[PDB]
Design a protein around this ligand. Structure first.
Ligand SMILES: *[C@@H]1O[C@H](CO)[C@@H](O[C@@H]2O[C@H](CO)[C@@H](O[C@@H]3O[C@H](CO)[C@@H](O)[C@H](O)[C@@H]3O)[C@H](O)[C@H]2NC(C)=O)[C@H](O)[C@H]1NC(C)=O
Ligand SMILES: Nc1nc(O)c2nc(CNc3ccc(C(=O)O)cc3)cnc2n1
Ligand SMILES: OC[C@H]1O[C@@H](O[C@H]2[C@H](O)[C@@H](O)[C@H](O)O[C@@H]2CO)[C@H](O)[C@@H](O)[C@H]1O
Lengths: 252, 263
């Protein structure tokens, strides 16, 4: 199917271009009235057809060489990517994607799932040291384009788009990166909220719409590494700038 | 489908004025004991357990509104004999603890230590701004709005406009108080105040007095909306040079968007 797609060319790209790009991607995967406190809740397997199961992300590197990666509308996941008659899928790779994404290219599946740990372990490095930014993005697309698409490059993309799609904190972190044309590495916080999407997700679904306190607490972290536990939504927002919720439970 | 889950009781603190917590006078678990504002700290009288039934209680004795009618103060009394409606509370993300049946909200006339609380006509004032959490410490943050620029604080009673972001200038360091107000970290004595409730109304940095103009709600859409007046704070005409942020009808445009970044 001709799944919809959003684009973003690093060349002649301003902080605003990126911000707008992310918005569009959100308006896509994020639909369906189910939403608490204003934030939407990504649909679930049952409530999403294959004709709208994936969204494509067209990223053009400086040199023009543009790589495209399909995201899973039911979680904003980087399902796969393709470069010049070539397509790759993680060790997982379900028949759904393998039989609907980039049909016509060479379907050779990689050798490691999209799981963060899986990537870091395959890239030989952890997110804490894979600097993201304008240039790091170029090298990423480039490596995926030519080199076939290794882990490290993928790890650079995953955060730059999906992560920034659900976390406005990461959004601005990148927005300032392109604004100052300087790179940066994920901090304890960014990485923490990166790992607590599911948790904080249900924690907000638990309290419900227009409810501030959390039935539990979100285990975030400060730069010094000390634990930053948020027990209310107001805090979670003013810090993580979350803009996308993942389904876990349905209202009660 | 997949129904959620009924949460069990959890204990959290309650702040809502000059960083003061809500607690039971002298920590006496005796009935009739009123509720007042008081410097936070590790103490049961300050801890409050929230239940599914919609009750809040410390020392085990439910927190009820005692008498009921605009001006009726709050106190703690046995849950059983507690007047059915005078014990149920609601905590909306608007940073307010409204009492269902009545419609009155936990208001703190003044923010002086020892100040007793009471149900009052919800009007949207910093006095009627509460935040339940165990972390009674506000987070430092820069309010980055239009063109990746950070909102800057000038002088007392002076305006407030977008200036080139600087993670060092304290004039850009904003302390988000649990009372739903925004004050200068440097000097938490002045809150981001508005001059009116009509569009184009100029925003500034007046003193903190719990005024309905100093009550800011951070909409999940990215806009800092003034509660009393549905108007949001934005960059006048977008021309940052004008040096003025004001209240204006939500347009859903970037010139009304704000991002609160950590330290
Ligand atoms: C925001 O402003 C507040 C003050 O309005 C700052 O609060 C406190 O600031 C002090 C100074 O950095 C922190 O430590 C202090 O260090 C001195 C020197 O050793 C010592 O004499 C004091 O006893 C205290 O340890 C203090 O931790 C900090 N917070 C509190 C609750 O006291 C705050 O640091 C400012 N935040 C930012 C990001 O600038
Ligand atoms: N391939 C791929 N694509 C992503 O978009 C992604 N996002 C995260 C970070 N965010 C999440 C999201 C969902 C979940 C959960 O359901 O458990 C956990 C963490 C980590 N790895 C990822 N890997
Ligand atoms: O009323 C104001 C404020 O004071 C404290 O109350 C008691 C406290 O409960 C008791 O254990 C201690 O011995 O003496 C305090 C005298 O102030 C509490 O700290 C607070 O919760 C309020 O109760």
């Amino acid at each position: 199917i001709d799944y919809p797609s959003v684009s973003f060319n690093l060349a002649g790209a301003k902080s605003t271009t990126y911000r707008d790009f992310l918005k569009n991607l959100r308006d896509r995967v994020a639909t369906g009235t189910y939403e608490v406190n204003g934030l939407p809740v990504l649909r679930r397997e049952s409530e999403v057809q294959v004709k709208n199961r994936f969204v494509l992300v067209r990223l053009t590197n400086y040199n023009g060489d543009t790589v495209t990666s399909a995201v899973d509308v039911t979680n904003l996941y980087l399902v796969a990517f393709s470069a010049n008659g070539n397509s790759y899928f993680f060790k997982d790779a379900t028949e759904l994607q393998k039989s609907n994404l980039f049909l016509g290219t060479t379907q050779h599946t990689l050798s490691f799932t999209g799981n963060y740990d899986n990537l870091e372990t395959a890239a030989g490095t952890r997110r804490e040291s894979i600097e993201l930014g304008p240039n790091p993005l170029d090298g990423a697309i480039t490596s995926l384009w030519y080199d076939g698409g290794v882990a490290r490059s993928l790890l650079v993309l995953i955060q730059m788009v999906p992560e920034a799609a659900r976390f406005r904190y990461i959004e601005q972190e990148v927005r300032r990166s392109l604004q100052q044309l300087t790179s940066f590495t994920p901090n304890a916080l960014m990485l923490s909220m990166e790992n607590n999407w599911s948790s904080m997700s249900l924690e907000v679904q638990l309290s419900g719409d227009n409810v501030s306190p959390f039935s539990g607490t979100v285990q975030l972290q400060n730069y010094d590494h000390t634990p930053r536990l948020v027990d209310n939504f107001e805090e979670l927002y003013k810090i993580t700038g979350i803009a996308i919720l993942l389904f876990r439970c349905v209202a009660t | 489908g997949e129904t959620c889950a009924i949460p069990a009781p959890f204990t959290r603190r309650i702040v809502g004025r000059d960083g003061l917590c809500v607690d039971v006078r002298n920590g006496y678990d005796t009935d009739g004991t009123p509720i007042q504002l008081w410097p936070c700290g590790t103490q049961r009288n300050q801890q409050w357990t929230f239940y599914n039934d919609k009750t809040i209680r410390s020392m085990g004795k439910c927190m009820t509104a005692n008498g009921l009618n605009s001006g009726s103060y709050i106190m703690i009394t046995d849950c059983s004999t507690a007047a059915e409606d005078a014990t149920k509370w609601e905590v909306l993300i608007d940073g307010s603890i409204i009492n269902p049946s009545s419609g009155l909200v936990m208001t703190a006339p003044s923010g002086a230590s020892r100040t007793t609380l009471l149900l009052e006509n919800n009007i949207h004032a910093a006095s009627q701004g509460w935040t339940v959490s165990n972390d009674v410490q506000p987070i430092a943050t820069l309010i980055v709005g239009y063109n990746e620029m950070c909102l800057q604080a000038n002088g007392e009673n002076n305006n407030v406009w977008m200036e080139d972001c600087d993670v060092t200038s304290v004039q850009q360091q904003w302390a988000l108080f649990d009372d739903r107000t925004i004050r200068v970290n440097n000097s938490r004595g002045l809150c981001v105040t508005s001059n009116g409730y009509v569009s184009k109304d100029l925003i500034v940095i007046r003193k903190c007095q719990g005024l309905a103009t100093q009550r800011w709600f951070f909409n999940s859409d990215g806009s800092v909306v003034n509660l009393k007046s549905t108007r949001v704070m934005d960059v006048k005409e977008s021309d940052v040079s004008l040096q003025e942020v004001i209240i204006f009808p939500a347009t859903g445009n970037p010139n009304q968007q704000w991002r609160t970044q950590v330290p």
